[PDB]
Amino acid sequence: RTFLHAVDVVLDPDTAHPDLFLSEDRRSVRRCPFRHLGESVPDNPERFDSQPCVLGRESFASGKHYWEVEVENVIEWTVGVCRDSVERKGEVLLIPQNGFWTLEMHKGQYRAVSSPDRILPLKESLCRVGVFLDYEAGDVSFYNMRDRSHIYTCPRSAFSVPVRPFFRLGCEDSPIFICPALTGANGVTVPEEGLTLHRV
């Protein structure tokens, strides 16, 4: 249990706000508002009904876990971790006391724990963001994956219940991508001279 887990994150379509449009592989998402215009969308209890959010299908109750998100050219996004038990209904505040641990891009600035009083003074545009969980440490940390530099660790919190990958999109037709865990030649013939520059 001392091992850092490089998570393979796949989005859970049952949590997804109806404006969110998941890829079929469920590793990317964009927001297309009123895309269910003239439709009655079932409002199952797991689904975010006002906040344009979606959870990873994985939940964590212990250990160390991280994943990477590509956010380049997205003007409004949130990433992080939330309790499995967060309120899904209404305009919930995305703050630690409600079981949300986030990093946000809002109006050209980066904000920790979605707070207007915690603007982060980064000197570059984030392109690939690392989301790190250490359950027993009460730790949610964010990294700039260009140089693997620390951005922010949230106030330490007792998670108490399982937590899940959290995502929010606040802009339209601008997709974020969740970086698949590396798999090497998994599922692929390796020629006897090796496999060169594999693409899919």
């Binding site: 599922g187 692929v188 013939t189 020629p191 006897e192």
Partner: protein, 178 residues
Amino acid sequence: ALFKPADVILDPKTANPILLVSEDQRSVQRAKEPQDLPDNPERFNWHYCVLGCESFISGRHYWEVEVGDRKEWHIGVCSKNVQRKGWVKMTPENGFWTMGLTDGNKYRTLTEPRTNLKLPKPPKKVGVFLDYETGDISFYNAVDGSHIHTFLDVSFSEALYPVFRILTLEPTALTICP
């Protein structure tokens, strides 16, 4: 007929968790993600392989496999005692006598080293012939009767199973002609 036609049924206890064996155990497809099955000793836990239920210990046998226009598949036989846990290279020396298709148009025999095959026509149906005592295994286009490959004069020390392998998620399943 010089070879007893074999009645080959896929053994779901041997199938890699990523393979889907049909209700009637005559066809196999790939899932998007492995199913949650036990790692019983008989299961291939790495290679995307499934055995027949019956192994061959003597005599002459054949069976026919519809490959369709599937862009990827390998078939043949293997020994009862092949490594089912972890990757092993599928070669005669590891107990595998197989051939098939990768990447739409590249036919090989799974020899050490692999050999590329020059097939005038792409086969939609393949015939596998085993003669335990001589030590011959041969592959034929089953519609037009052309030869594909033969492993000659092998000294088999083990029961042999039919073996089937698919890597790609495709619409064309792999089906044993009854």
